[model samples]
Target: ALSYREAVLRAVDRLNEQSSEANLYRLLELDGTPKPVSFTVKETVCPRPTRQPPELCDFKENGRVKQCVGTVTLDPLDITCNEVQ
Candidate 1:
């Protein structure tokens, strides 16, 4: 699902991923009004803390399981009191 989301917002021959400022953002003309949005990849880097043992997927040179596994950082924008809009 994570990889799918990354592919769908899918900018094809449009922009390079190397650019840190490359965003999928675009302006929308809604009812003749210009609207825009901001997008960012807020993933947690590896070698971080975890909540359980399954999060451990690597080992260090000192004969210990390295805490290199990171949890996926995805949170829904809960702005309403009801679910599913």
Candidate 2:
């Protein structure tokens, strides 16, 4: 069984990869997740090498953090995440 930390880390990497393909920004951090690892995975991303970037490129251009949820399972300890919209 993967610990919360391991699972959550997987979630972050998973989302970052998925989103990275969709845009130029990359996830920088996550707020929190449940032990079972199911939650609205709040996170922040930074502008990819953008000149000066923003004070905090935490949200998308719409001024909203891309909403997503993550799930973790035992045994192989798989971590999966998907964007809300």
Candidate 3:
């Protein structure tokens, strides 16, 4: 069994992968429908490189590595998943 942190990490990774693919599908109007569509999934990004001092970094925070964020898009046609694949 995976530890709690490990399980969360895996889940976030999966979501990030799916989100990238799904976004592409939606953009291409592959799912072929004429209604607004939305999806919820995890998104991850590295910390921005800035001039801020390195001492200010929160190395102990959960958001430090593999941080997940939610993304929403108003797909007008819902044509990515339903019609394309």
Candidate 4:
């Protein structure tokens, strides 16, 4: 099992790999729920040199952005499109 940080990094990398916004949206929506809407990366107040840990930085929905103070994890199977039409 991957660590939480590792899983998040994998998710981010997958998102970045998408070549088009439409593909990104389709992938993010595979779980049948609305996507995050928007997200941002913010620097940690106290930088940790040991790991490249950065906050989810910020996330927005309905025009409001919320500060994310903790790690985010994604279960790989949850985002899969095996049943998506």
Largest TM-score belongs to which candidate? 2
Which sections of candidate 1 miss by over 4 Å?
Answer: 1-13, 17-34, 42-85
lDDT order of candidates, top first? 2, 4, 3, 1
Q: Whole-model Cα lDDT per candidate?
A: 0.23, 0.45, 0.27, 0.30
Worst 10 residues of 3 by lDDT: 22-31
Pick the winner on lDDT between candidates 1 and 2: 2
Which regions of candidate 2 fall more than 4 Å away from where they truly are?
A: 20-36, 42-45, 48-63, 74-85
What is the alpha-carbon lDDT for the whole of candidate 1?
0.23
lDDT by residue (tens digit), candidate 3, 26-82: 011111222232332221132333333322333332221222233223221111222
Residue range 1-85, candidate 2, lDDT tens digits = 4465555555555554555443333333444333444544433355444433332445555523343344554323344545546
Question: How would you encode candidate 4's per-residue C-alpha lDDT over 1-85 as one tens digit per residue?
Answer: 2455455445544433432321111112111332232223222232232223333322222322122222344343223212112
C-alpha positional error of residue 52 in candidate 3 after TM-score superposition, expressed in Å: 22
> Model 4 TM-score?
0.26
Error of 4 at 11 (Å): 0.3
Residue 84's C-alpha lDDT in candidate 2? 48
TM-scores for all predictions: 0.15, 0.38, 0.25, 0.26
Worst 10 residues of 4 by lDDT: 22-31
Candidate 1 at residue 48, lDDT?
31
The CA lDDT at 83 in model 4 is 19
